[PDB]
Design an enzyme around this catalytic site. Sequence first.
Site, PDB file in Angstrom:
ATOM      1  N   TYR D  26       0.690  -1.364  -0.309  1.00 35.26           N
ATOM      2  CA  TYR D  26       0.080  -0.246  -0.281  1.00 35.26           C
ATOM      3  C   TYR D  26       0.847   0.983   0.182  1.00 35.26           C
ATOM      4  CZ  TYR D  26       1.410   0.942   4.702  1.00 35.26           C
ATOM      5  OH  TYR D  26       1.693   0.959   5.939  1.00 35.26           O
ATOM      6  N   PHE D  36       2.402   9.737   2.915  1.00 38.94           N
ATOM      7  CA  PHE D  36       2.176   9.501   4.414  1.00 38.94           C
ATOM      8  C   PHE D  36       3.606   7.843   4.620  1.00 38.94           C
ATOM      9  CE2 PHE D  36      -1.766   8.746   4.030  1.00 38.94           C
ATOM     10  CZ  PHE D  36      -2.286   8.265   4.975  1.00 38.94           C
ATOM     11  N   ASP D  37       2.953   7.460   4.733  1.00 37.64           N
ATOM     12  CA  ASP D  37       3.323   5.597   4.004  1.00 37.64           C
ATOM     13  C   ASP D  37       3.343   5.161   3.210  1.00 37.64           C
ATOM     14  OD1 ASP D  37       4.071   4.134   6.287  1.00 37.64           O
ATOM     15  OD2 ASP D  37       1.889   3.006   6.497  1.00 37.64           O
ATOM     16  N   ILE D  56      -7.077  -0.023  10.013  1.00 41.54           N
ATOM     17  CA  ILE D  56      -8.300   0.838   9.813  1.00 41.54           C
ATOM     18  C   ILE D  56      -9.118   0.843   8.986  1.00 41.54           C
ATOM     19  CG2 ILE D  56      -6.689   2.822   9.888  1.00 41.54           C
ATOM     20  CD1 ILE D  56      -6.676   3.470   7.930  1.00 41.54           C
ATOM     21  N   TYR D  82      -9.557   7.134  11.662  1.00 46.60           N
ATOM     22  CA  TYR D  82      -8.478   8.344  11.887  1.00 46.60           C
ATOM     23  C   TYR D  82      -9.531   9.328  11.952  1.00 46.60           C
ATOM     24  CZ  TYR D  82      -4.224   5.712  11.812  1.00 46.60           C
ATOM     25  OH  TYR D  82      -3.301   4.869  11.568  1.00 46.60           O
ATOM     26  N   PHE D  99      -5.665   5.477  -0.250  1.00 49.53           N
ATOM     27  CA  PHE D  99      -4.515   4.609  -0.536  1.00 49.53           C
ATOM     28  C   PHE D  99      -4.462   3.822  -1.546  1.00 49.53           C
ATOM     29  CE2 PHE D  99      -5.820   4.447   3.662  1.00 49.53           C
ATOM     30  CZ  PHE D  99      -4.641   4.642   4.519  1.00 49.53           C
TER      31      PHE D  99
END
Lengths: 444, 255, 331, 107, 385
Positions: D26, D36-37, D56, D82, D99
């Site tokens: 991902y 961010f990831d 999540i 979140y 994502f």
Amino acid sequence: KKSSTLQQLISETMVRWAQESVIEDPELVRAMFVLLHRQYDGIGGLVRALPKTYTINGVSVEDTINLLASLGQIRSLLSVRMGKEEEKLMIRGLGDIMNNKVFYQHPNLMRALGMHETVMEVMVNVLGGGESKEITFPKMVANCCRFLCYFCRISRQNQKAMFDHLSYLLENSSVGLASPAMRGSTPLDVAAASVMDNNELALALREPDLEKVVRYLAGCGLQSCQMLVSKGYPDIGWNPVEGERYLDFLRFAVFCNGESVEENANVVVRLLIRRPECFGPALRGEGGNGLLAAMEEAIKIAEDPSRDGPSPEEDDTIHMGNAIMTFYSALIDLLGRCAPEMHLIHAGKGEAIRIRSILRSLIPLGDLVGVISIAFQMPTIAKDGNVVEPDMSAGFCPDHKAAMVLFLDRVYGIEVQDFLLHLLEVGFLPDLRAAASLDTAALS
Amino acid sequence: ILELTEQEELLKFHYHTLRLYSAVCALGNHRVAHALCSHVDEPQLLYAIENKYMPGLLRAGYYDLLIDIHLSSYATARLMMNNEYIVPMTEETKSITLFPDENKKHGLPGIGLSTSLRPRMQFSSPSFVSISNECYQYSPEFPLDILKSKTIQMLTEAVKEGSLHARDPVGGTTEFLFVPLIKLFYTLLIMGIFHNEDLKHILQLIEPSVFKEAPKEGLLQMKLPEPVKLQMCLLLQYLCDCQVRHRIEAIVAFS
Amino acid sequence: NLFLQGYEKSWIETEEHYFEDKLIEDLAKPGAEPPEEDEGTKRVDPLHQLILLFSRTALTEKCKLEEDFLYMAYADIMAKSCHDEEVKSFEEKEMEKQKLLYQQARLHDRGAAEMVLQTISASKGETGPMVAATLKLGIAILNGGNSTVQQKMLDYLKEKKDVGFFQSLAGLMQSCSVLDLNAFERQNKAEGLGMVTEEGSGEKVLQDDEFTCDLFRFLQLLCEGHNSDFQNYLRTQTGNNTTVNIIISTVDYLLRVQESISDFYWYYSGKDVIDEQGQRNFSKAIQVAKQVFNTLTEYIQGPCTGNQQSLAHSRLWDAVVGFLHVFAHMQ
Amino acid sequence: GVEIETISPGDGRTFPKKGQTCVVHYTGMLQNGKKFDSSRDRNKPFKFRIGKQEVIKGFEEGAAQMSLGQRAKLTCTPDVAYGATGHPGVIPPNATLIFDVELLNLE
Amino acid sequence: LSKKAKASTVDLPIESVSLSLQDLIGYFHPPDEHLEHEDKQNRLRALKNRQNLFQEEGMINLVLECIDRLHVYSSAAHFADVAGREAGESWKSILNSLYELLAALIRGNRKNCAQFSGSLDWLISRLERLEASSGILEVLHCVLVESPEALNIIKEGHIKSIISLLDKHGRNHKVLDVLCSLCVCHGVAVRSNQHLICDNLLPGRDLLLQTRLVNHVSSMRPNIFLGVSEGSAQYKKWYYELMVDHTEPFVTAEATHLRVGWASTEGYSPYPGGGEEWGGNGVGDDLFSYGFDGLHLWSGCIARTVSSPNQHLLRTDDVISCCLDLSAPSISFRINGQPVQGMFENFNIDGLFFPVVSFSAGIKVRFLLGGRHGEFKFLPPPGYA
């Protein structure tokens, strides 16, 4: 020709650098000459490593690894600042180190790791933080004090290692003595555990350490407790809850394994008589109602709720009468400990004879007889079928008379035939008859 | 970033930003380290490690950021455990000897068997899609094997280049070329990732003649600046400490 | 584990090897600096840089003087290299004197004379291993009464106006300890009860005996050779704003030690025979007293009228009377 | 709600079933476009199990509707992942997450 | 003056106070670095003695009172309205001198920086003002560096105020340095301060410079330069195809770039316009180029999803047919014979157009231009050249 050894290569290199250039970096010079000194002193590495060296069993390797990880966590949390989550981590790590069995099995490794010094350092940091505005994080302070008390009990050598910080602990003795349910978890208790049942340490103990405690006790006699009257307790001129802890520490210092350390006892009694204010309002000597009257008025305080209670979680209720009575019992017990042994009196040592004379002058025999003559209350079965219990933390208690009997036997001396039967009649027979009356199973 | 060489104000602001990145995660703040893994990624870190044309200040800041994010916690813990010499008694510990072979020749430092108790190395995967909070313990994971090969190759090239005394060092100065690289190698060596022939080759890089196992000027005789000399001193201190630890283990073996 | 500890303090601690003179020779040798590209004034030798570092660290002002392991190591190394210690021949003795002079030259040419005063001044009158090592180094470099290093010390004191030097000297001299009858009685009770004493020498009594002898040996070597200038400057620091009387403080310490010796005599008055513990305590106290008497004599030699007057009006006669009584009764 | 759009087609028949570990790469970026990831940055595949409340909520339901070998873009509203407090330091409060997910293998 | 008394009656010794402030700054000036160690130590001893005497006489509080009395007025013009014009002229200089004097008195003295802990809260309240931001920041930096109690007294609001200053007054390294000093002091780290700085500054990604790796993107174009002009002899419709022999989705951590379409030149120059030369930009990242990646229509660095039969990013063995019409501005595409319903319209035609492909590493693509060089897999649309 190559140097063929790391030490020779370094010895050449470092001097070569120094003679090639003038070093302008103080840390560079520091490291340079430290390394050179290490190279030309190889025995120093061995004499520094061998005390730290330890050998452990393969079966206990795993538990040793767990204990080492806990020690490392505590060491890093030393470097980090102190907060709530840090206090939780301290508590949990200390508990893990308690629960580790290697901790008990190998105290020598525990000393070699310097763990007691680590706990000392963290406690010093927390006590220094907020010194005038009351000790913050008293829970972790209590955890550290309990850890240091357990360390003393593990082995005698741990007591000797704990002894060298007695000066700091006595300076920081007044931390949480007033607060109940904190008993046994203060630096004063840490010092008491360090000096407990160790005659070598009791003899090695110095006079200034005693006189510091004497000054604290005198302050507790002239000045009231601030935070008790802040919570609203009725203002009395002295502070028995603080005084009794110092009295107990002095007892532990002077009396060891059934025998009375005379060299400590003499110094303690001289300081006590030099500062007569340590005794209390009963033993003022000037306008003092006496010990017997003091305990009778303290019993009356105990029956009256407004005079015993704060009258403005159960531990917050400090029974003022019980505290005063425990203070006087502890003072009498300390003086009884300070009383010299019988064989020295038979020998006729003038110092011991005059010590006994001073003790008899301080405490009349009549007060001791009257205190034993006082009787306490019988828990009684009710109509419904329940035996009602008077408070154990409030009112007359048997240890108070135990201290009186200890003083009577160690100081005045029971050798008069008619006085023995007089004491029997006044104070022993009612107690024995009460014991015989409570002999039913429900009262048993 | 390579363009930032001529924008001085942006360079200074970014260098202080990297210093702030180090400060916030300094002293084992694992949650902050995991958070910073999102901002500064592993590929960016490695590219900053490798790039020759990098500005000196940014290069030093990036090596410091890498060390303080992934490496500082375990390095400090193992340094704290360095002085203690808790040694189990097993068959390997019994087999430990002062000298490898019959003749009295000292083996290469660090090389051999060491059965003293050591801290356990633990790492956590920096994932922001998982909800489990146990990842906030431990340091974020980094490819230590790639980092080690990376480092040895860069150190070999730096040793080859600097002895030529060229006027174009990596980062613009010899200090910028050497101090951060040697700091990273120091951190790795304190961890003890270096094993066997890697340690042998990099000790050869430190000194060819003395550490030959059985012309080019070594890092000892390369006529170094003062901070680089200080880091050299730290490396030699570690080597001597390893010697002492081996001596203690052999003493216990005889005991 | 028991074998590890016993092996340590039985073999490794007792193992001794001598390298100090060789180390100082190698450090002092200038390693081909003129062959090296200096392009300026000749660069300072490694020993000179080490002494300069130790001097700057002492010069740096702190609340108290911290312990420096490098200092306690290198000061001892330099002292051993400085002294390096049937009837010898006269030329043998003179050659030994010349060799010792050259050894002291190697050190005090580099600034050790100033460093040993700077460290004592920064000590702020607190007894410690730092001060003990500094005093031993001073004794080593002053052995034989070296007028050159005496002149260097006096010139440095007069140029810097170190009131702190004499203030710390005084403070250390009050901090010096004497015989303790109470501690001796506690030790005797412990030994009689049979519990093993933690200290082998019973050094709670006469807590530091090498330190006091070293300090007074230093104060005597400072005045050896009838050095009138330094003798007067000790009593009266004319340049300094504040003056401290080391001469008076020495006789005060002598009075205290004679009081302790008289008390220890009165302790051993009843007993028929003196035990070995008391005998060693007497020996240590008598040696300290000898050192104090020698220091006072070196103060008053070379008709130093000021020192003679100061000790005349001081409390010396009481100590002399005490010693006379103790001597009359011991014999 | 979770929206799934197809970037590259998958097998189309086998789907992630309950009691299985999903191996995915991902890449997460905010709605602005800032990454961010990314598991591809770490060069290690991400393994998670269906219905175990370990990832999540949006990334769970969106992956549940994918197929083996399929590459798809997953858009997660703030409420599903979140919600309001956000992730301290990484994700600002009330943010929408995108994502790019590839279902490498089911095991 | 604040009591609205007459200005003539009021005595205000501006010149004397400025001269005395300069003298005090010179008197508390730190030693020179070129001096030897002994002289350094003498000067540090003298400076420390001066600082201790000033603190024990409580001159710092007097400085604070003067600073507050100056801040009661908003600006130099306002102070010139209230007091004299010379006072208005020198107000900023006097305020800066007083702030620097406070900094010089507090530098290097732990007792002074610990006694400033109580006054720290009032100092932060004036940080937002432009006339004293630098001086207040310097004083705060000195206090935080020297005193740990000053570090403990810092609260969540005071730590948000610094970030707000960084946002409002622009990026400045002194703010970052103060925030760095906040995290760790004397080797002791404040975990709460670290957490607050992280959770407030970092997540925004709006103040600190952002960094990321991006693949190099290169663009290949043919020699043809076709355009439309009034009364010009050029055909208005053109067509070409692209053949993808091999593509790799992920050669690195980032996705492989592969876009095809048309681009225009600035004016009549043969140079492509509106775009950079080297970097990660490709076709569609400016208003000059018009692109297609198989899923998104690219123009002006904005991507719009366009539907297609069997939507997919460009794979191996794909044929992309691009059409250009200039009589009616329209760029239309058709993948493998299936036409997309996305089209760029009504764009500037005052320039020369040319086919172009933008890509990153890991491609194998072929230009099918028709005629000699190539042939078209599919039939060109009617009327297209």
